[model samples]
Target: SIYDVSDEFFSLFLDPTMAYTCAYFEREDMTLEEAQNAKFDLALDKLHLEPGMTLLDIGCGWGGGLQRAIENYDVNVIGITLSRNQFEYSKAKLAKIPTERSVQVRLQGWDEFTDKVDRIVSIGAFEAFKMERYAAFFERSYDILPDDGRMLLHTILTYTQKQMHEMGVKVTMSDVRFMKFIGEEIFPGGQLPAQEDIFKFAQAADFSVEKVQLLQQHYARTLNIWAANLEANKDRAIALQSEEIYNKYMHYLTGCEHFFRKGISNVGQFTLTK
Candidate 1:
């Protein structure tokens, strides 16, 4: 229910397209909209989408990715989200796509989706799922995809405890408290996973890892922009929501910016095939 906030509040900081995930900044001088579009193109290109294929967007925030897919490719796009705000926003925005193409948005989770799809893209949605449910999530994905189908899984990552030990990294009390704060305030009942854990579950579900790409710096930059936007619209944001909500998000955004910059966390993009 963290996503029950008003769309106007989110629009205060997000780009016009309202992409809540990390953006791809190929150049240092790129604008937020440019970087977000680049990210969508990168993810979509990796899927090698074809006409008549059905593409599933796991967390279609504001329907940006879905709209982009429909505009650029001749494919059927179905987007699902648990956020009521996002689902309504996506539905309204996607209703304008030509009637010839099949583009739909539903207020549901991935497990609730039973239909088959040729390609899948999940951007920034995995963090909302509890760590224990990763296997079931992958299994559901595997069930819906054919052997030739592809899926792009993108999420924020933290290093496993063993990996941290191997690399001589020590977890401090501050680290624990920071993670707890984010978990409680922003993503309740959800946990970030280690790279190996994701692979273990995916492989158990019989998925082949075709590619693994890192975008830690890009996420840092994205957070930096979001924080600046929030600051620029400080009074408006405070009025739209509350002072507490504004402060919480500012801290969350900047703290995550620091985390990504310091390598405390990373953005992982995985391309998987059945």
Candidate 2:
């Protein structure tokens, strides 16, 4: 039920890029647009994209990163997503870009993608899969990637009680329910995994972890901006959706911001090689 929201509804809070992932605020004063662009550039830089390389973006939302890579780098980009709204929006967006680089956005899931690509980047999409399916996800990436192919996975992490304590974040009964609420209401069927689980699955799939970057505070800032944007455009948002929906999303954004800020949850970017 998440992400089916109309593009206009998301556009109110999202940057012009329509990126839904955590932004990289290299500078404290960076605007949302700058932060989002920096994040895309950072991912591409980490991938070390080369001319004519085929790039696969799994769970590509709005095809923003796909368009960015195609416009700047001489690479063929294929973006896949399951959301109908995202597929339609990205299809139209990509068509308007006058680029010779082969770019395609498909309304499909990662499992349906059969073509092997040189580089892969999946942003904020890992959280959508159930915990058990996580291993299979890595296995699929391993199957499609070449021997030296690289994959970047950006996802939110759920902390264990012990880890939370180690981090000085006291685990409370209500805090547990708050996370449960987010999983149930904001992202139905989506369960955030811990960093340990990610490493286990990637290593099990025979992929070596090249890098791991934690962007917990960055996500907190991003969510803070999003919530403020939603609040500022309250009238327009209510008109586009409804009072109930607006309130629900406002709650989701604010609660997520708190979680990231307090270490209830964290965001990470993992670079892996096959």
Candidate 1 structure, TM-score to reference = 0.94
TM-score of every model versus the real structure: 0.94, 0.95
* Sequence-dependent TM-score of model 2: 0.95
**Tens-digit per-residue lDDT, 1-274, candidate 1:** 3345788988889999899999998788889999998889889989988899999999787888888898889999899998888899889988877757887888988888999999999999898788788989999998898779899998889887776778776767877787888778776666678888789999999999989899999999999999999999999988887888888888889889988886788998899997
Error of 2 at 244 (Å): 0.7
The lDDT per prediction is 0.87, 0.87
